[PDB]
Amino acid sequence: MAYPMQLGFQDATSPIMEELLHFHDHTLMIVFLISSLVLYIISLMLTTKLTHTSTMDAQEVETIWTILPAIILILIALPSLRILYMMDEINNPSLTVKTMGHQWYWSYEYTDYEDLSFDSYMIPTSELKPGELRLLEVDNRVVLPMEMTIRMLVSSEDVLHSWAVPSLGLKTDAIPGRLNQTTLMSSRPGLYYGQCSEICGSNHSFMPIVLELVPLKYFEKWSASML
Amino acid sequence: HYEEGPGKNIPFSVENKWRLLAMMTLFFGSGFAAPFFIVRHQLLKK
Amino acid sequence: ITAKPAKTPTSPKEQAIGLSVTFLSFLLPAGWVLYHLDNYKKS
Amino acid sequence: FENRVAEKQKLFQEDNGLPVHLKGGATDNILYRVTMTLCLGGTLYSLYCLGWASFPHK
Amino acid sequence: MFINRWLFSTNHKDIGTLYLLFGAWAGMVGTALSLLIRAELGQPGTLLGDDQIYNVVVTAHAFVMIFFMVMPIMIGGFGNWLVPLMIGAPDMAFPRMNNMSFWLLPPSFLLLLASSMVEAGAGTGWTVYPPLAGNLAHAGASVDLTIFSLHLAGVSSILGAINFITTIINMKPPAMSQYQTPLFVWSVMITAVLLLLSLPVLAAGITMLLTDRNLNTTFFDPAGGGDPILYQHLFWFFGHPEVYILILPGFGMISHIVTYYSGKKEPFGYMGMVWAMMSIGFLGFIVWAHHMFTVGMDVDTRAYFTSATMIIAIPTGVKVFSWLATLHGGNIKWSPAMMWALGFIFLFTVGGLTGIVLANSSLDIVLHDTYYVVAHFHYVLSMGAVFAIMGGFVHWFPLFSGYTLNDTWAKIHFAIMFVGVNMTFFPQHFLGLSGMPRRYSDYPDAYTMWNTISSMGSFISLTAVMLMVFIIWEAFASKREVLTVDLTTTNLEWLNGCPPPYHTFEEPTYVNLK
Amino acid sequence: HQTHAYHMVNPSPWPLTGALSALLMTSGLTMWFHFNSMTLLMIGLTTNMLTMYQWWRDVIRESTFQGHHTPAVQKGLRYGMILFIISEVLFFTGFFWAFYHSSLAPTPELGGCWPPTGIHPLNPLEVPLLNTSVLLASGVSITWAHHSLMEGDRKHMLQALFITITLGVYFTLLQASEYYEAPFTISDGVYGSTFFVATGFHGLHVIIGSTFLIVCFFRQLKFHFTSNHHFGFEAAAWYWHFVDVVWLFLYVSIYWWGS
Amino acid sequence: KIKNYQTAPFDSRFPNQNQTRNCWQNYLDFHRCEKAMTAKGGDVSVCEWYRRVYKSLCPISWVSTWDDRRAEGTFPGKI
Amino acid sequence: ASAAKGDHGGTGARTWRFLTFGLALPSVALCTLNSWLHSGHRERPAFIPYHHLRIRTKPFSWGDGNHTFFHNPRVNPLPTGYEK
Amino acid sequence: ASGGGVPTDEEQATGLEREVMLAARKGQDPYNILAPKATSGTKEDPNLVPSITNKRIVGCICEEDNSTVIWFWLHKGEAQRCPSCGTHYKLVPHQLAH
């Protein structure tokens, strides 16, 4: 989850999210360089009494202004598309979990073996237990085995929603009549939080996601206990 | 035919600056107030 | 740009009145609604 | 039928100061007044209907 | 005489004036809506106690600022005033159709008011995506009133586009080729072509939404074999060209302001600037699905939209660099209008570069539907368009009015605004990176500090807006009449004096072929 | 006195009456769909028809009667009409996009096939083929009408234009009969949605195009057109060819490929 | 043949993010197979792979809606 | 190139009238005959209350709210089936 | 055959359209439809700029393909020069004659 005064991304929980952090650092360096160069050149154009107001030939400089930006874009595109095709590469999941969006809560279905499903609602602020997080905690968390490739299938039973977990680099829209697939792999046990990311009406702000990542053996016993 | 020149090529009078202050106050003030009164309306019908 | 001197000069006092009335036309109606928000909810 | 365009050219080029929408004569003035009455009356009725639709009615 | 002049106009200047007045009024509505947004978010918890109302406020803010403030001011206002004057034309091609484009806007605005007042409003976002905008999640008249508001605004801008294209192609001096028209006239021509091609697709999409809501069609309804994602394609096929439509006339004005206050007779690399605006217009039609990177898109499609989106940076950079090259060697007049233009160049650039971050579909997975996108577009669009408008307004107010502003007051207004917008939006980058969703009435506690600062920024811009109204009052109150303007030899719009006569160019300019 | 060739138009009320008619028609549809009343809508349609009638009457007064349409003014009207047609093509493009999206990836609710389970499409070889022959024939007759006008032949211009209008009317009555006879409706899922809204907008454009040709017929009867000056006829013919081409794309896409 | 079934493997017919057709195809394949083994007196056990794949992938409310429509005679796919 | 006649080369109007009466109206007369001969009312199909058809998310704004605008009782069933 | 019966522009054109048609027949351009061709532009052979008043705006395209047009009021009296290229222009006022 986010912590007070955070400037950057949540720490990476997945190897894909770590890839994104290094790609963002690379892209942000280019953004900071270009914006500061433009500001500096502005200051440079504005700080001399020297003048040159006759027609200036544009041909030579327009080569530099076209080729250099083109190279910079390629230096962003190369690692960008590497991560894109990396993300999409065949994963062989061990488990499939479905989430259905509703106004305004998530449902989860784990139907590889038994019929396990349940609803996951926000804890109202008045009911939080001491040290729990306003607008983030749910009654029933999404328990998942750690260090395993999981296939999440996302849909909706009503309007659009979007199923997001920033620390795992995940955001997948929840569209009725459609079954969208993403893959999830946590390097670490823990609690990982996210929030509905497609405006779905009056309680859009109030239908969070909580993943609980634990060893397989705990996941298996939890599953059996939820039937 | 039509009036020409500064202060005449406009649909409001600038003949008196205090009358103009009142018109500008009502014009811009009515724009700025409207969303406050629409929120009030929506809070009250509920 | 060059211009004539003002036909109807606006003194510092006249500017203070213009500015004051302009600011109040924006602040008072919004202020009134925002002050009474709690009253609106009980309906 | 016969070509009466020269007659219409004389009517519509008459140096009488009238705008083209009133230059055909009294009928233009009537069709203008009916159009503007329906528009301004209809617009007042749309505002009434807004007023009505803006509040619940059990 | 009043009705004949102001309701029955066939004069490009008076219609331009009506557009600027309309746009200014709309700007106050949009501003009040923005301040209600930042008041809801200015401390943790609820202010309105009603997130449907919050969502209606967010939706209305966007529609007002885009359709009733920016487009009317830039195309309706500056377009109508300046385009005939800059090409020596006695009016628009279709001076009477021109008046209907104007008069469709008050009823368009009334339909949007009506939508907010009836039932619980349209709390859809300005994208109006089904099924949230459909007849089950948004039963009643509100969404239908929003759709009709867009229909009237669409007709206005399409007829406006036909008028501008025809005027700019047909009504120049016979010796003046398209490569002798000022950059602002090019910016309006290219804008009009994007409007002509984009708005009919929006019109088709929202008409299908209207039939889904009222005639039991199922274009967007899976139960009948429809698809919500079809709506998104039709919307954004319009919506991406729309964001270039909102900035292009600003690019035109910035070229004129930087040239003028640099004491240059012309912008650097004129043909490069024409090329860049045409290239941006063209590329603006092939990038739309970068709004849809999280809907479940195949990897090859995501790769294509990432790549096509990024190449827009090349023509845009040529413009930014050419503006800098225009300043280079200038006798700089530090006028208020120049300050707006230099702010524009810097802030537009920051917003453009966050665009390039978002173009990368792999990062956009994490940044989509967050405050990073909000930060992005309040830099490029909100600051870019508003800074170009304020620069234009300050620069050309004495042409339109015949009266001068107090420059000292105008510089004070610029300083306050520059501080306010940066305090408001810069922190929204941190909120986005750290995962705060957009379209939220409330946020987890960790997001409090940046939300508090952003809401304080919004009040500083409010003080700037109130001050702008007083500054316009002071100019009309004092009546300092314009005498002499510099550089009329390369700024034809000033050459008929201030304000120009009702009829200009009754005798056309003389331009020969050497 | 101007020394340019362009037209400074008399101040006119028709832009304002047109804008207000747009408010009455849209708020009228809202009252019809939600508040069970047709009153605003009928006022809106009435003011819209009055606006169009008086506006285009005035254009005829300005041109035929007052001589304001110089070649420069005529060239502007040519651009205007082409740009208007382009915007109508992009409108139809949205409906073709919706059709191809729905029909190339039929969802499970349809049975995962196109046409959907339970839909019995019309035979494209029956009335739809007749409709095609009728609009193609009308493109030939209007071309005859155009050539007769340019060659100064009043009677053959009037015959050819009458034939064109009659084929327009025939297409409209054939389509109204097909609508009545069709065993699917606009409520029959995305098949009925795409069929009726796309052919329905096309049908509206045929009625508008037919009306425009009827205006040109009555202007020809009253000798308004010269053998060299008749932009209203040319505009009506461009629009009519537009209507024909949109039909050919509907026929190939919806009736034939989508059957 | 393939016991220790964990979940539905990658299927090169359905390699993208939209898996709607994967769920639907396996649902159809199960009920077609299951029909063919009643019509030929055979054994439903042969159909098992399809049952497991559609149960893994298909939302419960979709399976449940399709089952209701087969019973009502309103299921639009060919079984 | 399913079309073979020499370019007719007289008055433009004369050629287009020739095409109107010699090719276009004959084609319409022919298609009119073909339509006359495939014209008879065909047997209406068995009603199945498919959930993707006869959509009603909101009542229509005319009649009883349940009849489409060009409702034909012979061939258009309601959600509950054909009318008696 | 053609039975005729369609008016010609010669018969039925009126107002400004007719005035433009008849002036074009005489090779004249009172409504400024055509670009004037430049003289050498010297003090002895200035560009002659007709006007119906005592001043007219000139735009000077100093060199072929210049994108910048130089604009200035040409007054009745002595020839004036383009402030960019010094080319000479002289106003030739005239009553709006027939």
Ligand SMILES: CCCCCCCCCCCCCCCCCC(=O)OCC(COC(=O)CCCCCCCCCCCCCCCCC)OC(=O)CCCCCCCCCCCCCCCCC
């Ligand atoms: C810059 C736009 C216009 C000016 C705006 C003025 C107002 C802001 C000041 C002016 C601030 C200077 C700009 C740099 C940001 C400082 C934060 C930082 O170190 O950022 C770090 C990164 C992420 O890094 C990390 O993951 C590591 C985090 C380190 C942890 C240490 C914690 C201690 C932090 C203490 C709080 C300080 C925060 C400041 C809080 C500021 C509150 C307003 O954040 C991000 O990605 C955010 C990046 C947003 C992308 C926008 C495009 C950038 C172009 C604008 C620059 C103009 C150049 C001229 C520069 C000169 C322009 C004046």
Ligand SMILES: CCCCCCCCCCCCCCCCCC(=O)OCC(COC(=O)CCCCCCCCCCCCCCCCC)OC(=O)CCCCCCCCCCCCCCCCC
């Ligand atoms: C027989 C006569 C009766 C006729 C009936 C009318 C009555 C006439 C009076 C009597 C006539 C006799 C002559 C008196 C002259 C006017 C006197 C006056 O001060 O009268 C005041 C007039 C004029 O007022 C206005 O138009 C409104 C503006 C008020 C002050 C604005 C100041 C802002 C300046 C700063 C802006 C900078 C931009 C300009 C920069 C450029 C400057 C050149 O009032 C009105 O009665 C206006 C009626 C409608 C006219 C069209 C206005 C266009 C609408 C603007 C957009 C609205 C958006 C709403 C959106 C709606 C959606 C819900």
Ligand code: HEA
């Ligand atoms: C042109 C477009 C534009 C402009 C100017 C603005 C201006 C502002 N907007 Fe925004 N905004 C949008 C377009 C714009 N906006 C869009 C499209 C949305 C998304 C809606 C959605 O999600 O559906 C959005 C959403 C949005 C959000 C996110 C809401 C959410 O996600 O829940 C916030 C939050 O802070 C915000 C704040 C602000 C503020 C504080 C201002 C301003 O207060 C800041 C600058 C201030 C001004 C005061 C402008 C003044 C100009 C004039 C008054 C004209 C004067 C006229 C003449 C001189 C002729 N806006």
Ligand code: HEA
């Ligand atoms: C003025 C309006 C405007 C303009 C011009 C732009 C310009 C661009 N925008 Fe943005 N945009 C919006 C308004 C605008 N945008 C709005 C309103 C939204 C959100 C809509 C909503 O959801 O409500 C949005 C959303 C948006 C998204 C979707 C984000 C999401 O929802 O997840 C993306 C994705 O790629 C994007 C990309 C870009 C890019 C790449 C440009 C490029 O055109 C920018 C190019 C400019 C530069 C790069 C700076 C200058 C260049 C140089 C100095 C040269 C050197 C630079 C390099 C080599 C990089 N924009």
Ligand SMILES: CCCCC/C=C/C/C=C/C/C=C/C/C=C/CCCC(=O)O[C@H](COC(=O)CCCCCCCCCCCCCCCCC)COP(=O)(O)OCCN
């Ligand atoms: C619901 C569908 C709506 C469709 C609309 C209806 C269409 C049918 C008819 C419409 C009206 C036609 C009437 C004909 C009247 C003509 C008067 C003008 C004649 C005239 O003045 O022009 C003369 C034409 O004479 C000549 O031959 C005569 C020129 C030929 C004219 C008549 C030709 C007959 C056309 C029949 C159409 C065929 C359609 C198929 C039906 C087959 C049944 C036999 C000039 O002659 P020329 O070129 O010098 O040489 C002629 C010698 N070859």
Ligand SMILES: CCCCC/C=C\C/C=C/C/C=C/C/C=C\CCCC(=O)O[C@H](COC(=O)CCCCCCCCCCCCCCCCC)COP(=O)(O)OCCN
């Ligand atoms: C040859 C055709 C005859 C002409 C048409 C005659 C009558 C009214 C039609 C108006 C024309 C508008 C077309 C598009 C609108 C909707 C679809 C209409 C097509 C149509 O007529 O379809 C009918 C349905 O009409 C229905 O629902 C509804 C009927 C009317 C409802 C009014 C809809 C208003 C929509 C507003 C559109 C605004 C968008 C304009 C864009 C402007 C640009 C900004 C089909 O009949 P059915 O019984 O379902 O099936 C046949 C079974 N026997």
Ligand SMILES: CCCCC/C=C/C/C=C/CCCCCCCC(=O)O[C@H](COC(=O)CCCCCCCCCCCCCCC)COP(=O)(O)OCC[N+](C)(C)C
């Ligand atoms: C993300 C990547 C960032 C990219 C940023 C990179 C930018 C690269 C910029 C490099 C520019 C290098 C060229 C130097 C031009 C400097 C300006 C200038 O003033 O250059 C003049 C050249 O102009 C002449 O003459 C000939 C007439 C035409 C002169 C052309 C000048 C070009 C000006 C370009 C300015 C660019 C500034 C900002 C760039 C962003 C110098 O005049 P001189 O009297 O010496 O010569 C004439 C001598 N006689 C007349 C006696 C023969």
Ligand SMILES: CCCCCC/C=C\CCCCCCCCCC(=O)O[C@H](COC(=O)CCCCCCCCCCCCCCC)COP(=O)(O)OC[C@@H](O)CO
């Ligand atoms: C859902 C409900 C929404 C309802 C919205 C309806 C909105 C408005 C309704 C009122 C419209 C009726 C009034 C008729 C307007 C005629 C315009 C016209 O015909 O304009 C002409 C120019 O446009 C040209 O040619 C070519 C362009 C002709 C345009 C024809 C008018 C189109 C109106 C609708 C456009 C829809 C846009 C397309 C997308 C579907 C003439 O220009 P003027 O400046 O008049 O004169 C010039 C003089 O020199 C003539 O002598």
Ligand SMILES: CCCCCC/C=C\CCCCCCCCCC(=O)O[C@H](COC(=O)CCCCCCCCCCCCCCC)COP(=O)(O)OC[C@@H](O)CO
């Ligand atoms: C539900 C209700 C909706 C609306 C229903 C009906 C709508 C429209 C009815 C059909 C349109 C009739 C248009 C009549 C135009 C007559 C005026 C005219 O044609 O004017 C001509 C100029 O053209 C011009 O303005 C060109 C003007 C062209 C106008 C283009 C018309 C198309 C408008 C259609 C609106 C479509 C909306 C579609 C919905 C999405 C005049 O020049 P000439 O002809 O050269 O004459 C001069 C010579 O005589 C001199 O010798």
Ligand SMILES: CCCCCCCCCCO[C@@H]1O[C@H](CO)[C@@H](O[C@H]2O[C@H](CO)[C@@H](O)[C@H](O)[C@H]2O)[C@H](O)[C@H]1O
């Ligand atoms: C985002 C937009 C920014 C808005 C910021 C507005 C700044 C405030 C402007 C002041 O507005 C007034 O404030 C008074 C309080 O100070 C209110 O009086 C209220 O409170 C008084 C004292 O408690 C009572 O005397 C009054 O009767 C009672 O109406 C009054 O209604 C309201 O107009």
Ligand SMILES: CCCCCCCCCCO[C@@H]1O[C@H](CO)[C@@H](O[C@H]2O[C@H](CO)[C@@H](O)[C@H](O)[C@H]2O)[C@H](O)[C@H]1O
């Ligand atoms: C110059 C132009 C200005 C004209 C202003 C016209 C003002 C006319 C106002 C009265 O008309 C109202 O509108 C609705 C339609 O007429 C009626 O509702 C009706 O709507 C349904 C259909 O007609 C009925 O079946 C419903 O029972 C009923 O409530 C309503 O009673 C009636 O009072």
Ligand SMILES: CCCCCCCCCCO[C@@H]1O[C@H](CO)[C@@H](O[C@H]2O[C@H](CO)[C@@H](O)[C@H](O)[C@H]2O)[C@H](O)[C@H]1O
């Ligand atoms: C299927 C839909 C119908 C197609 C519609 C095509 C639209 C054409 C508009 C009118 O333009 C004319 O058409 C023919 C161009 O191909 C030519 O005809 C005529 O041209 C010559 C002289 O006019 C005569 O000698 C010839 O015999 C005769 O074909 C003529 O040059 C051209 O101006």
Ligand SMILES: C[C@H](CCC(=O)O)[C@H]1CC[C@H]2[C@@H]3[C@H](O)C[C@@H]4C[C@H](O)CC[C@]4(C)[C@H]3C[C@H](O)[C@]12C
């Ligand atoms: C009345 C007029 C003859 C005198 C004239 O040219 O003014 C003629 C010439 C062309 C004739 C029309 C054309 O022949 C086309 C139509 C033919 C139909 O059989 C009768 C109506 C029809 C619409 C005719 C009416 C009338 O006889 C017209 C209009």
Ligand code: CUA
């Ligand atoms: Cu669910 Cu937002």
Ligand SMILES: [Cu+2]
């Ligand atoms: Cu975009």
Ligand SMILES: [Mg+2]
């Ligand atoms: Mg989204």
